[PDB]
Amino acid sequence: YEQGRFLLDEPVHKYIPTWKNLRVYKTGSHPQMLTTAPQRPMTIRDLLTHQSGLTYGFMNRTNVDAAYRSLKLDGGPGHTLDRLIDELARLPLEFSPGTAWNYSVAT
Amino acid sequence: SNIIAGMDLNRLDRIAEHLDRAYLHPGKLAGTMTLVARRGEVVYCQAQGLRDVERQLPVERDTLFRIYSMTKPITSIALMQLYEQGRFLLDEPVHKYIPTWKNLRVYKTGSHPQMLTTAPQRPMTIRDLLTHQSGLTYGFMNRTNVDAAYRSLKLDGGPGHTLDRLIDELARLPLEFSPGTAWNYSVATDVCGYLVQLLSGMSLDDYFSKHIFQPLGMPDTFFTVPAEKLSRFAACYEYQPGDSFSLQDDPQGSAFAKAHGYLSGGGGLVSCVDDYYRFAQALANGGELDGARIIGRKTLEFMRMNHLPDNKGLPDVAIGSFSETPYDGTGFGLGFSVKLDVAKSQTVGSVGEYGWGGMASTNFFIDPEEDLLMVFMTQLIPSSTYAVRQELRAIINGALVD
Amino acid sequence: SNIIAGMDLNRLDRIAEHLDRAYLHPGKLAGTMTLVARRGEVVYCQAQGLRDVERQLPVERDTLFRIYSMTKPITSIALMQLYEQGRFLLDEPVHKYIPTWKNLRVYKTGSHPQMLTTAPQRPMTIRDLLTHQSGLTYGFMNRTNVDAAYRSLKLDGGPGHTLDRLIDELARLPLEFSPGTAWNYSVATDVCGYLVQLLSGMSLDDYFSKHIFQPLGMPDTFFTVPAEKLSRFAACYEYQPGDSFSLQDDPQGSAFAKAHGYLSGGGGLVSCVDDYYRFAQALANGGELDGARIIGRKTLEFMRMNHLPDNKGLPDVAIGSFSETPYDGTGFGLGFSVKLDVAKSQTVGSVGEYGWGGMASTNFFIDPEEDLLMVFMTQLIPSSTYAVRQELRAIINGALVD
Amino acid sequence: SNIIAGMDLNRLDRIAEHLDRAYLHPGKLAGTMTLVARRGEVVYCQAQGLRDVERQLPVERDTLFRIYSMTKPITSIALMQLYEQGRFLLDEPVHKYIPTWKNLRVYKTGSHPQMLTTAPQRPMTIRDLLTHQSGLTYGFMNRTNVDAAYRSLKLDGGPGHTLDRLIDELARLPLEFSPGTAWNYSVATDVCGYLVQLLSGMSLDDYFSKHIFQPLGMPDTFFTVPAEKLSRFAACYEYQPGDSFSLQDDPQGSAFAKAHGYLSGGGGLVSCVDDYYRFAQALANGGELDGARIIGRKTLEFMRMNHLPDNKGLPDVAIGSFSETPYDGTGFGLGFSVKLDVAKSQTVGSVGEYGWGGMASTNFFIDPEEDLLMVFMTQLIPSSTYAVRQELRAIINGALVD
Amino acid sequence: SNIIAGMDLNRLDRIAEHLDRAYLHPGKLAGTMTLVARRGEVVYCQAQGLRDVERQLPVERDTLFRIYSMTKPITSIALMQLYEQGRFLLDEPVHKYIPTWKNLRVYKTGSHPQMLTTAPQRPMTIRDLLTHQSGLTYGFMNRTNVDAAYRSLKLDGGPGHTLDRLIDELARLPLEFSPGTAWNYSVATDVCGYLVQLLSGMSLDDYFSKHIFQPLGMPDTFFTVPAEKLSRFAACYEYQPGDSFSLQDDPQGSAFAKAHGYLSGGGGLVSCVDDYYRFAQALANGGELDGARIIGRKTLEFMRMNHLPDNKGLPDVAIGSFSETPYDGTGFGLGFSVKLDVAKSQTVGSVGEYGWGGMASTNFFIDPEEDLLMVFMTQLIPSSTYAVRQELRAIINGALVD
Ligand SMILES: *[P@](=O)(CCCCCC)OCCCCCCCC
Ligand SMILES: *[P@](=O)(CCCCCC)OCCCCCCCC
Ligand SMILES: *[P@](=O)(CCCCCC)OCCCCCCCC
Ligand SMILES: *[P@](=O)(CCCCCC)OCCCCCCCC
Question: If residue B367 lies in a helix (H) or strand (E), which one and from where to where?
Answer without folding.
Answer: strand B363-367
